[model samples]
Target chain A: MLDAFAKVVAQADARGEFLTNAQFDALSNLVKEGNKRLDAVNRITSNASTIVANAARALFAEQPQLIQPGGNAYTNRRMAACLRDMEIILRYVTYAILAGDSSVLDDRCLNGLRETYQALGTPGSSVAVAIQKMKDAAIAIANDPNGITPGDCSALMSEIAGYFDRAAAAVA
Target chain B: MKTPITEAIAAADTQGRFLSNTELQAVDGRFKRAVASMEAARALTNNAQSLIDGAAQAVYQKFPYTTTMQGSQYASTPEGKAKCARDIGYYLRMVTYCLVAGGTGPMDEYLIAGLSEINSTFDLSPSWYIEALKYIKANHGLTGQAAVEANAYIDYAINALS
Candidate 1:
């Protein structure tokens, strides 16, 4: 859960010394890399609507059976539930990434929603598809080296990816 | 039991490229063809035998002398063609599994580790494997975005095995 600066400070504090050159450099890179982190989160949060709509559209398009006669996402009411959960899960993922901690995501956000899905007869498997589609859309949007500040952010990207995967696995 | 993210990091680490710790607060697609990609996977599963046979045919045509070459893979006395076809089918199915899941986790989790070892035991060279994958990549028969999704997995295999 510790950011790079906090972590660096903790290590120096444990030894009761001034910041080492290495510690100082680590802190230096944090500001640089931290912006990449912020960019990643910012893109996903900003495009939240298109991300949700497109993901849900793709989900049902691929698994059309889900909207047929007796499926879990069959009716408009259930469809609303399905889309709403996708948005909720996406928000929780952003929360986890911002905090750099999955505790909030695991305990407070996705904690008990699994049983709730079962109660509602919404298939966790299909919900996972929605998340997967969102993962697809979000990754393309964030990692897009299109026109924003450019850096690898490869590690940051995976961390963000891990959060979404957590959201999917929680219910699944 | 693995979720996609843990599975992804594990796969990358195995290749010596670790995910970053900007997790210390640090932070980090289009869905149309992606969903179409699932349908493409389904199509691959359904047409497994014929498509694999098609790729197998191309491999032999492209390098008709492989079976006759010294120490070449698929040099078996009588079973070379069918055995080669079967193996290509395995890769095709593996790619389809990952494609349907919308992540590479299934392949890393299920296929990658022992693949090279097994290939060597059968005298399969890396180039030979890549050639077969390339043909299978074209033979998938999906058009538009589905084709894009399917080839991405095929490209993944070629990169790994190469």
Candidate 2:
């Protein structure tokens, strides 16, 4: 199947009809960059999760009730950012691979966790929702590989876009 | 693969005459302020990025495909569509803010109009519209922007040519 796809792509190249091999190479690099970015985001969020988890551990050392049932600000923020980053990373990795962008692949995995730290400002509910969404996205990417299309990718792009809308609304 | 983005940037030397550098600067600056607004409020999200990407693509798509003094032939036909798509793609790629961040908000007519001045050079083709599904295959990233920009440039170029 991959060979079949490759053959169609090769025909396009032979005719000089569409995107060039060089352009595909560029796109392939972009895909790698995207994958690296997602991996980094996951790690950062994971680290952030650990920090909050450890903090909770310290707090729960004596009285467990001290922490809210919903978790505290540190927990909420780190978790929210982590989930969103995960969503973003998974979304882009899928896009990069499908789109055949190389820079996405070459990109070092996010380098450091940054945004999850920012999610700390929002309510726990909001962060929780974000985490769920991220999990859903990750699962979707893993489960429905064939079902995903450029249109689906565009939709993911839209969802990725919606993240900002929610962010702006939250801030506003 | 063969984006006209580079061509538009290079042609900026010529199109520079039709440009309002101050307006362009202001428009660009406004988006910068918008990003700051998002950051300051600590309200970052992907929508802002999409809006920005949308507007930037729109603007870049409008870059001059032909100078204002060209004929209808300059803006119409397969070759014209190809050129417009390539130019839009190239222009968008050349700029930094286009990829990572878009304009701060939906662009005003004035800014869009400024883009149109460049866009009018590349007229649309009916056949191209018919093959719209193939746009992804036919065009690079800046197709939407190119569509609007081409309309603007075509109008102006035709008038200028007349």
Candidate 3:
């Protein structure tokens, strides 16, 4: 089957209908860029999940009675929902990268971030900062895959968390 | 394995070069135009998809059944928002196709029929109806009797959000 496929591809190339070397190089660069973006989003998602989880943890610690059956259902529910929305953002990011469909990232993941921001009811400077960072990273990586290293993703993620940590403390 | 033009071009730079600078410029101009056309077509497709998404969202938000419809998807309880959006998107796309092709077919009739069907689905307030009509008119570019029929369905979505 592999040989047959190669044969057909060679025939197409002979017909002057196949991609040239430059075209192939462009496609390779595109795929690599997509991988780098996924790496950045994965780091961002990891950071976001940690921020929400820690915030939820702190809320539980401060008011242990909240979880004890209807004590503070609103906060508990909101926290849980906030965490879920984080999961959704991560899920959509993964979907976008694997499927190579930016619409998922734009429509679903960003919407999830907005929803999470609203649920927190605090100055979501952290979420906003993370979103802007992600958007900037996305724009920077478009077509040209330079400037942003995987390490940069981790560094930006930490910066994002600091803002979230401060916001969480203020809310608590 | 080299084509004659490639061979000629390769030989042109050396001492035996035959093709003049003018010939090279002509070739470059045609090649650039072909690339530009391809890029323009791709950009047009992207613009169409973005427009469709915007139009669909408008219809979904104004659709009267959004609150009561039951499903578990994006919001707390999912309504048939995606379905309604998709239907409106299809109508808009078909209308766009008709406009671009400069001919009418079953699509125009189908869109009118679909609008009528959507109207009967719920009790649409006048404000909601006008908004819906404006959205369709802005996107679809229908005229004459077809336009009138299409506009009639605009007042069907209930103003639940208001």
Candidate 4:
């Protein structure tokens, strides 16, 4: 799907032509499919009170080394967080879809997602703080005298990603 | 040389940007500190370090054993020339960023002067494809790797500032 989008974007860039409505529909379909899987994950949050604890346990049990460094711990944790955040992101989209009296299976999902995303950017969320920290840290390492440490870079990406995961899991 | 703690924090900041919090905290809780530092230094520190580091990284490979002035035209290989053009474009883009952020005052005026220099030199370079694309991306805040690549360009450009 990313490939398709990239192909279209590249074509547009090269040819200097806007994509047709059909192309827009195709991209929309891809986004919908992507969100479909995402929505299923969010449904788990319906019982987040319990599901979150389970997810955290699974995080450790499935990939115990994520807590350790030097391994693929960072990447593993990041994937986990991505999965969780996908759910939260979907839930908000779902809310928007419902508000519009349309299913996210419809095109309204993207609108909902955009609106929710913007609100999340307002100051005060721990999630925002945590994410920015990761960005800042990576930039810092890249600028350091000795250059960035691979393990540390990996770890920061992993850890920041986890915040999103845990935050999503906490969502009700 | 910098102090041990300062070095440690700097190291941590670098590592922290990529790590998750659990991992970041384990590394001495300096990632957030670094973010705050960036926020404070904003343009000066951000542009200065990025430029110096990026220039230091690519210059040696392109120039072999010497350094030249900002627009001196130093490239031996095809790749080297391409890189030099890229850096020039990148530098101009950084100046633009500062210009926008600085607003229509002294800072903005200074930025326009730098931009004019970059524009003139770019017209004379072997290929300004990357730089030209960079100008569009930097001005518009478009996504994808274009912005990231532009940042690298700006890094080299920022180096010229110092």
Candidate 5:
């Protein structure tokens, strides 16, 4: 269903012609409805609250050393906080999309994760890769609205879930 | 000559790349003392104290190093206080570096003038730090580890301020 939007975008690109006014309006409405449906799907499948709660517990249960007192203690705590912040960011993005607030999808909204990732350090780490993927997902949504579909949002949520799973796996 | 504590830590770093437990403790002690001393100086009401407070506060506002900086004093714990003090030192050193290494040019002049305002009661917001970071990178060719560290600090500062 959502692939149809991608198909339309590809066809328009191939023809090298601007979308007609009616087609553009249809795309806009489709995006809004898609965002609402994605929000509902996210709530049912992998909501931020559940994802964050499970991740936090996993971190505590598995990698207790991370939050323990030591030289890397500060960095560890920052990483934990980053996960919590990611939860908030996801919630905010979902809420904004559902509420039809396009303004929240800007670069400024994504800077928080970028800074936290830098502070976490180790640019080549697995967690870093996970964060970069999430950042790329947000960028894709913001830069190419015509290309964005409900499946893209679902894929992003799944990637976020995969990140938590990997984090837990690392500790396990 | 360096202090006995410094010499002792230096000895522990056999290869100059890593520190032993003893060296780590010594370094930690130095950091604690540095933060305590800075806090003590900030408590005083003199020109030097004012400059220290102003510069420290400006850095604290722009970049929240630790939760303690949000309060009136440094953290009670040694590690937390050290982190806070490190944040202060980072900015002060950057300002000093700009004063000396930033050549005689418009960008350098701009940074110098901006940094001087810290000597008095002033608000050098995160935007100023961003501009300073850009100017240093573009003109002074700030690169390598130094560039990464500076950019990271600026980004952290901007994030906190935002």
Candidate 6:
């Protein structure tokens, strides 16, 4: 799960292990585009809830039958849990955002989401919609700094974009 | 590495067949951990030497002498031990082919009658050679179909040696 430097620190941490591949890639972006990365990290920090809750709201509104009878998100507990899964993924994205790498999201989150949901009872398409919606929201929130601030480059935007895109594709 | 453990596990994961307990040994059989298909071929082909090496060591350990102790009939000289390991390596090499091809036809044609006649002409005891196959049979580290397939090929050779 960990990449080289993170692993070095981790092995250094408890005497072994602590980082991942995606995290290394993000750090490259962080050091390369200073303002862009900080903006992304800040934007995700404040707007994380909007990313999950807003995306899900639009997803459910467009596909009412998702919450209707006979759907995967058909009951209170089921729908509540469905919403939680979305939040879980979004929360995982923030960990990656903070670390400047996608490892925290993939290693800790989406991969397990895929098995538990896709290999189990969750509808892949519906979950895909929720993820894509979050992608759009994260992109929207970060694109021009969403009125909070701005950057000198767009690497962070694309990096953030890839995370959600990867998260969605994982389940797909 | 291409053996049943990796391949069958790879196959079942890709195919979604999953794992079980007793059959974990057997499923790689399904995954055929040396148990079946391409996995069985490479697994046996690759380690076929270790199979001979381990069993050859087993046999020599039983004898444990470069020459006769109390004038034992079956004791080998140092050169004889080397020759036996070499010879078993040849037999094991062929056994892998029969395993990969899933037939004892090779053994029947290439080994059975010819080696038997030779062993007889030399007046050598078949006991040690046959016991090598028995040890190969219980190779716990090695599978179901492939394991048993090895057994069949080993059995074929054993019966011939006998």
| Candidate 4 segments exceeding 4 Å error | A1-168, B1-79, B101-162
As for candidate 3, its clashing pairs are B12-B17, B124-B156, B124-B157, B129-B154, B129-B155
- Residue-by-residue lDDT tens digits, candidate 6, B6-76: 33233433453322233234321322222353344456555666777898878777756524543324445
Pick the winner on lDDT between candidates 3 and 6: 6
**Better structure of 2 and 3 per lDDT:** 3
TM-score each candidate: 0.45, 0.21, 0.25, 0.21, 0.28, 0.43
Q: What's the DockQ for every one of the candidates?
A: 0.01, 0.03, 0.01, 0.01, 0.02, 0.01
> Best TM-score goes to which candidate?
1
Worst 10 residues of 5 chain B by lDDT: B98-107
TM-score of predicted structure 4, chain A: 0.24
Chain B TM-scores per candidate, in order, are 0.72, 0.22, 0.38, 0.26, 0.25, 0.65
Off by over 4 Å in 6: A1-29, A32-35, A145-150, B1-162
Off by over 4 Å in 3: A1-23, A32-51, A55-74, A99-101, A111-172, B1-162
> A35, model 5: CA deviation in Å?
7.9
Provide candidate 3's TM-score on chain A: 0.37
**Reference-based lDDT, residue B138, model 6:** 68
For residues A28-62, could you state the per-residue lDDT of candidate 3 as single tens digits?
Answer: 34333433444443444445445445545554565
Candidates in order have lDDT scores of: 0.75, 0.33, 0.39, 0.40, 0.42, 0.58
Question: What tens-digit string does per-residue lDDT give for candidate 6 at A1-172?
Answer: 3321232233322532222334334433333454454455556556766777888789889999888898887889888888788877776665455344565467667766667775567777788888889877777776753465444546566777787888888887
Q: Is 1 or 6 the stronger prediction by lDDT? A: 1
Tens digits of per-residue lDDT for model 5 on B1-162? 244354665686656766667676765665554443333323221233334445544544555553344432334356545544444444434333322222122223322332432312122244534443333334323445444433443344344334
Of 2 and 4, which scores higher on lDDT?
4
lDDT of 4 at A149: 20
Error at A92, model 2, angstroms? 11
Error of 4 at B140 (Å): 24
